[PDB]
A paper describes a structure:
14-3-3 proteins recognize protein partners phosphorylated at serine or threonine in certain sequence motifs in all eukaryotic organisms. 14-3-3 proteins have a highly conserved dimeric all-helical structure.
Here, we initially set out to analyze the mechanistic and structural basis for the 14-3-3ζ binding to the 18E6 oncoprotein. The observed conservation of most interface contacts within the two complexes suggests that these crystal structures can serve as templates to build accurate homology models of 14-3-3 complexes for other E6 phospho-PBMs or, more generally, other C-terminal motif III peptides phosphorylated on the antepenultimate position. Nonetheless, a few noteworthy differences appear in a subset of the crystallographic conformers of 14-3-3/16E6 and 14-3-3/18E6 complexes. On the one hand, in one of the four conformers observed in the asymmetric unit of the 14-3-3σ/16E6 crystal, the side chains of Arg –7 (Gln in 18E6) and Glu –3 form an additional in-cis salt bridge. On the other hand, Arg –6 of 18E6 (Thr in 16E6) mediates a bipartite interaction with 14-3-3 in most of the observed conformers. As concerns contacts within the 14-3-3/E6 complexes, the crystal structures have shown that Arg –6 can mediate more interactions than Thr –6 with the generic 14-3-3 interface. Interestingly, position –6 is an Arg in the two strongest 14-3-3 binders (18E6 and 33E6) versus a Thr in the weakest ones (35E6 and 16E6).
Residue numbers in the entry:
A (entry chain A): 0 to 240
B (entry chain B): 1 to 240
The structure:
Amino acid sequence: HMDKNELVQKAKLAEQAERYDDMAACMKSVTEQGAELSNEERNLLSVAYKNVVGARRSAWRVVSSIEQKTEGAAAAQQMAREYREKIETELRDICNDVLSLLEKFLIPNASQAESKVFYLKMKGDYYRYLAEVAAGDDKKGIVDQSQQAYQEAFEISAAAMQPTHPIRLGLALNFSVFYYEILNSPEKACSLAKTAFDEAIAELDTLSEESYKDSTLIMQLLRDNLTLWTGGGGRRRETQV
Amino acid sequence: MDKNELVQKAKLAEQAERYDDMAACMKSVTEQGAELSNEERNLLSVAYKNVVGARRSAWRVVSSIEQKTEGAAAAQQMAREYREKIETELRDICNDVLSLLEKFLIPNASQAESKVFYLKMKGDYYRYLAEVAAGDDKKGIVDQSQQAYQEAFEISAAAMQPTHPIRLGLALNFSVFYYEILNSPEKACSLAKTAFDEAIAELDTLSEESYKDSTLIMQLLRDNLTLWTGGGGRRRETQV
């Protein structure tokens, strides 16, 4: 059995090799050893599972579009439907894997506000991924679970973290996307993103260069979504005194 | 199920970039024992190139990292063991493809261009084995790759046009084999240059579609030749 250092070293090797199943298995093993993850181990775990589920999400959108495009061909549409359902099962199993890890190991032992916000955001993300493909009688509960987790994360970070903190900015980005795509609520999605951006830009100048670089990267994403969602109108071009 | 349904599933898997599914569909088609159509042959080879390719790239990444870590030793052992795990997956993939080629693809090939395709594929997958083999094991593997390429080469020189994409692709890969596996760069260059030159003389007779098919591979030959003969005193190019 590998100790923690060997598992982290192997997860980094697997990352460079783009072997994300291996990477996630290593970081799940690290997690279940029961010690609080460091910032870099948190990033390795989250990057690994995002890529693992990300392959299915992309494949799911492709096959869904083919299923919609072949509506006049029974055999072709049925084959695409069955293949989408197969991908969905994989996707749900990955989400349930992550959600179980968050509930059983990560969230209960998060002793600092930063890490708890990170894991509650992650819980919001993976219920959101479930909500992207939920289409039966469980969608309503899943959508609510996502919003509850995001909101709990928002509550802790609003009180414990500066608005420039990358975790708080990343939470605002994804929670905004949840409102836009899952709830079909563009006005709330935009005001949430705009508020987090405005609150950060007021303090951005006070950061060290390295922290500034980190914050600005996420603030770029908030800006890009706002511009995408509001088009040429709404946003007024900027000039400088 | 039926051959046609499996082919449709393979094409769906291709669009979803799920190459394990794609490869599994086309393996089942091959195992039905009927000669593959050109479309089926390309789906099979595309699928397994992607499946094996993921390990080939991972193996090179891990090898490169392993060769650039000199401060530690237990980390060095962990990097080696991870490479050996990737190696085992790579060999199993190659052995899977080589078994299909021996049992179904090469025996059922009724036309010259098909036999050259599969003999080239056999050369390719022994070459992938040769990329990771060591010692006495490597010699036999390299010989297997060379013998397959050479038989494909002799058939294609006799029976296929020099512009045929399969003949040109054989020249390209056989040339890389000479350069990289046999450490014979001049012979690799002469093989690439001769195939390129032999195809030039008949490009004028081709349809637009065949002209593009042939020249796309001739550009890969030229790319390797430019890479292998270096810039030397070459001045960078600008276009009016």
